[PDB]
Write a protein that binds this ligand. Structure first.
Ligand SMILES: [Mg+2]
Ligand SMILES: [Mg+2]
Ligand SMILES: [Mg+2]
Ligand SMILES: [Mg+2]
Ligand SMILES: [Mg+2]
Ligand SMILES: [Mg+2]
Ligand SMILES: [Mg+2]
Ligand SMILES: [Mg+2]
Ligand SMILES: [Mg+2]
Ligand SMILES: [Mg+2]
Ligand SMILES: [Mg+2]
Ligand SMILES: [Mg+2]
Ligand SMILES: [Mg+2]
Ligand SMILES: [Mg+2]
Ligand SMILES: [Mg+2]
Ligand SMILES: [Mg+2]
Ligand SMILES: [Mg+2]
Ligand SMILES: [Mg+2]
Ligand SMILES: [Mg+2]
Ligand SMILES: [Mg+2]
Ligand SMILES: [Mg+2]
Ligand SMILES: [Zn+2]
Ligand SMILES: [Zn+2]
Lengths: 177, 38, 162, 97, 38, 261
RNA sequence: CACAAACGCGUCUCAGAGAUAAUUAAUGAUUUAAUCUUAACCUAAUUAACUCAUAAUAAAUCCAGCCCUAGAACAGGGCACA
RNA sequence: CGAUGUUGGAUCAGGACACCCAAAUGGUGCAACCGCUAUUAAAGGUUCGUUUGUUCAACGAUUAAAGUCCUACGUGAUCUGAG
């Protein structure tokens, strides 16, 4: 508790770097927590006029997952401003083109709509796979828990667990598969 | 203003809508489905 | 489980049925009076698309559903299980239940988009260009309404459209 | 029996069915017999004979079909279903002939 | 093909199939019986 | 390195001389542009990963200029090279098997007759131009009572939109800007003076510098295999080229004087 | 066409790959037959858009004067041969 | 109503698709050539004249075609003024 004034204040308002794994996660749920950490709403010292907001590093963005048919239905529209410059693109296409786009747009959508949005977007770092500049790796304080529990496929289960789950019904020996 | 009776189905005052939504029929739901019973 | 074998020898072809061993229903069910296979294990309103260990028990090695009179499911639960299996396939679970085709594994396509809880088939769905405003809004289906009776531990009903 | 008539059985020489009536497993082979013996398939070609071999002791039901490709198709119905025999028969004896 | 709001079989040979998220009526005998639900 | 199928050569920087007629054995008349290569050297080499991540980049210099009127930085650049300063400098994308060594001369023989090239330059500057010359709008009629309107663009937008769209064609600067002619056949090469005879017209004013390369048009893609490739080296062969190289369809300055039969 | 130019009525040049909708097919379950499948898996045949290869641009800081096929001004190219 | 200047042209066109042309298809009382229908597709096109102030409309000659509309019946601080 006993610090000099300067180092005390420096410690309190310190920036922190969080790591967030995106594999098999919905871009929305990712963007929710990314948003909170970006605005610095996780800090009890929070205020809108204090610069406090933290770096967020999201990785494996390419492997993002989308509930339901959203890959097909959801469209991202933009306009170049020139007549006939209106462009609608299915999320699948956008993602195929630019791996980072989806999650970035989501986060950009969930920040408050003032000017600071442009700044706290500068503290966001998005990597399609896990390849990160060692520079940015050396800043990471901690890794946030992934917001969706990823179900294992059928081949992921140990034979113990497979034999531990009951055969529910008994097939006739005559029947062919 | 529209006549009491009309062709086009006549949007209700919001409170009446609430009233309608509250009073909907609720079918009795058996504790166990009679089919999965013996 | 009965395999059918075919052999070609010297312009004579032999086709014959051969019986293998079938695993049996686990010894002691919780609700033995219970009629339908799901229900005597107390699985009603519990299994989801996510539970593979349950789902793989009704299907064919090539991935399709097993017929109802063979399995013995209550009609309703059959439909539910079918939905779940479709969803599970689409979700990239049960990778071993596809048909094997030596040629087609080689020609890569854009890496499979990870998805889950998908009600329709990917090829059949038009992109919704027009969205629409707050009052008339086009909502995107998620999961299936056949499952809307699953037990909710949160207490809030599952959200079937966004 | 209808799917055999559409398929022009005239490519066949001789069809015999050997089965053992008092066995529990012979229903399939019998169904096959009555599907081939029907008037449509029987009248598609008159150059083909259909023989029913009936024995008590043989204990193994069987179906043997020769055709003019110099081909001999022998399917032993034991655990085989009727329409599996008929589908096999169709794709085998039509695509070749 | 005719796009229709109501599909109905016009003969015994029509069959009724769900493709591309729609319902269809295909007929092999009379192609004129083809129908696509709108 | 030998020639691989998907490979691409260096280009040149030439000087547009003028235009000349030339005839083909079928009797037709073509007009050609004379491009003279004056002093052409490769200047530096940027590797594949350092530039586009796809192809390497060679930098090529144009004709020699005075030392005195350039900048200290640039003068240093050429100092460490050992060339005199070049007027114009351009960048060429090059497959990594085609790379040359900075400080190497390039000549006109680098292109062989019959081939197709692409020529890039600043077009003739026509300055600030009206809407008719710049865009090609009709004007309004001259005589039937039009007042002070004979050239003006007319309506520039819709009433409802209440703004004018970003694309809108309006009076403005015309011509000093870079364009590329594609699919130009090369007919003749003069090896003594280093002159390329190209087909048709090449954007730029005469006596301006110009950037030549092999045609990137799809039809001509693989034409490179028959060409002197890394580039042409008057040293290595130890056998002189003829004064001029021609395409086989070209009537030469002396010849039978064609007779049909 | 009475400036060395501008200009047409004159001359030159103009393109690959992927992607799809409707609609056709192949394999095949729920519904051990069938069935192009808002069943899976691989699949083929297929409009226009639209993306994208590719091309263009791409040397930080001498600049008084003078010249210019560069230019409203400001900028820009030349000024060692000869 | 202490002024939101009005028809048709000119100029430049922005958009819809309920497609006139170009592309891909289904059905035919589709043999072929023509057609008649229906689906999908809006990047690009959609003529010149005689008379009418005219929009329509008639007529001559053509076109791959001479689309239906919205934009203050687009556009008068850009023009016209025949009405
Ligand atoms: Mg009233
Ligand atoms: Mg000029
Ligand atoms: Mg004029
Ligand atoms: Mg006047
Ligand atoms: Mg006046
Ligand atoms: Mg005047
Ligand atoms: Mg506005
Ligand atoms: Mg089948
Ligand atoms: Mg078929
Ligand atoms: Mg590009
Ligand atoms: Mg200068
Ligand atoms: Mg008024
Ligand atoms: Mg006023
Ligand atoms: Mg227009
Ligand atoms: Mg349409
Ligand atoms: Mg057409
Ligand atoms: Mg148009
Ligand atoms: Mg009106
Ligand atoms: Mg008006
Ligand atoms: Mg007016
Ligand atoms: Mg006005
Ligand atoms: Zn039950
Ligand atoms: Zn019919």
């Amino acid at each position: 508790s006993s610090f000099s004034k300067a180092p005390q204040q420096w410690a309190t308002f310190a920036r922190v770097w969080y790591l967030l794994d995106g594999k098999m996660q919905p871009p929305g749920k990712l963007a929710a927590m990314a948003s909170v950490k970006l605005q610095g709403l996780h800090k009890p010292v929070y205020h809108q006029l204090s610069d406090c907001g933290d770096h967020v590093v999201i990785m494996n963005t390419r492997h993002i997952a989308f509930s339901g048919n959203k890959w097909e239905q959801k469209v991202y529209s933009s306009h170049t401003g020139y007549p006939g410059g209106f462009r609608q693109v299915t999320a699948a296409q956008l993602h195929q083109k630019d791996p980072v786009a989806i999650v970035k747009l989501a986060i950009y959508g969930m920040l408050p709509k003032n000017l600071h949005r442009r700044t706290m977007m500068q503290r966001l770092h998005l990597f399609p796979d896990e390849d990160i500049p060692e520079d940015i790796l050396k800043n990471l304080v901690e890794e946030l828990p992934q917001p969706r529990k990823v179900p294992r496929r059928l081949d992921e289960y140990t034979q113990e667990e497979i034999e531990a789950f009951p055969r529910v019904w008994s097939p006739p020996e005559d029947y062919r598969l | 203003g529209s006549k009491a009776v009309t062709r086009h189905r006549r949007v209700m005052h919001f409170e009446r809508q609430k009233l309608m939504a509250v009073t909907e029929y609720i079918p009795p739901k058996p504790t166990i489905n009679p089919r999965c019973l013996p | 489980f009965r395999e059918v074998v075919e052999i070609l020898d010297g312009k004579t072809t032999i086709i014959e049925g051969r019986i293998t061993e079938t695993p049996q229903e686990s010894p002691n069910p919780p609700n033995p009076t219970g009629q339908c296979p799901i229900c005597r294990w107390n699985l009603k309103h519990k299994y989801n698309y996510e539970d593979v260990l349950l789902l793989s028990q009704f299907i064919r090695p090539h991935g399709g559903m097993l017929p109802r009179r063979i399995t013995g499911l209550c009609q309703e639960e059959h439909l539910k299980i079918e939905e779940c299996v479709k969803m599970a396939h689409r979700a990239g679970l049960l990778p071993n239940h596809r048909p094997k085709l030596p040629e087609g594994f080689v020609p890569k396509s854009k890496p499979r988009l990870n998805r889950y809880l998908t009600r329709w088939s990917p090829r059949s769905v038009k992109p919704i260009y027009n969205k629409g405003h707050r009052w008339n809004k086009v909502r995107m289906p998620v999961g299936s309404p056949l499952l809307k009776d699953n037990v909710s531990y949160s207490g809030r009903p599952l959200l079937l459209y966004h | 029996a209808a799917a055999l008539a559409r398929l022009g059985l005239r490519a066949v020489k001789q069809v015999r069915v050997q089965f053992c009536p008092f066995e529990k497993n012979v229903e399939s082979t019998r169904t096959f017999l009555q599907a081939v013996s029907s008037e449509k398939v029987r009248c598609t070609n008159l150059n083909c004979s259909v023989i029913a071999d009936v024995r008590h002791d043989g204990s193994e039901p069987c179906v043997d079909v020769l055709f003019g490709d110099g081909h001999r198709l022998i399917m032993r119905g034991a655990h085989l279903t009727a329409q599996e025999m008929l589908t096999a028969f169709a794709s085998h004896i039509q695509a070749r002939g | 093909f005719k796009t229709k709001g109501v599909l109905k079989k016009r003969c015994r040979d029509c069959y009724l199939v769900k493709r591309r998220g729609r319902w269809f009526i295909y007929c092999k005998t009379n192609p004129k019986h083809k129908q696509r639900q709108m | 390195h030998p020639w691989e199928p998907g490979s691409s050569r260096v280009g040149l920087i030439a000087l547009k001389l003028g235009m000349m007629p030339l005839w083909t054995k079928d009797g037709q008349k073509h007009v050609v542009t004379l491009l003279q290569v004056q002093d052409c050297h490769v200047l530096k080499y940027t590797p594949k990963e350092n530039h586009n991540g796809r192809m390497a980049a060679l930098t090529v210099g144009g004709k020699t200029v005075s030392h005195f009127h350039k900048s200290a930085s640039i003068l240093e650049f050429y100092q460490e090279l050992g060339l005199p300063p070049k007027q114009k400098v351009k960048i060429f994308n090059v497959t990594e098997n085609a790379v040359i060594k900075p400080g190497t001369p390039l000549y006109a023989a680098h292109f062989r007759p019959g081939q197709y090239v692409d020529v890039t330059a600043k077009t003739i500057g026509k300055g600030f131009q009206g809407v008719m010359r710049r865009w090609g709008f009709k004007g309004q009629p001259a005589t039937h009572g039009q007042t002070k309107t004979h050239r003006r663009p007319g309506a520039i937008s819709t009433g409802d939109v209440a703004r004018v769209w970003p694309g809108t064609k309006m009076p403005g600067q015309l011509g000093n800007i870079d364009r590329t002619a594609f699919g130009l056949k090369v007919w003749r090469i003069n090896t003594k003076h280093n002159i390329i005879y190209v087909n048709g017209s090449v954007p730029g004013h005469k006596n301006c510098l110009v950037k030549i390369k092999d045609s990137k048009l799809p039809a001509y893609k693989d034409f490179c295999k028959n060409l002197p490739f890394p580039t042409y080296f008057p040293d290595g062969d130890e056998e002189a080229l003829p004064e001029d190289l021609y395409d086989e369809n070209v009537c030469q300055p002396g010849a039978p004087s064609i007779t049909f039969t």
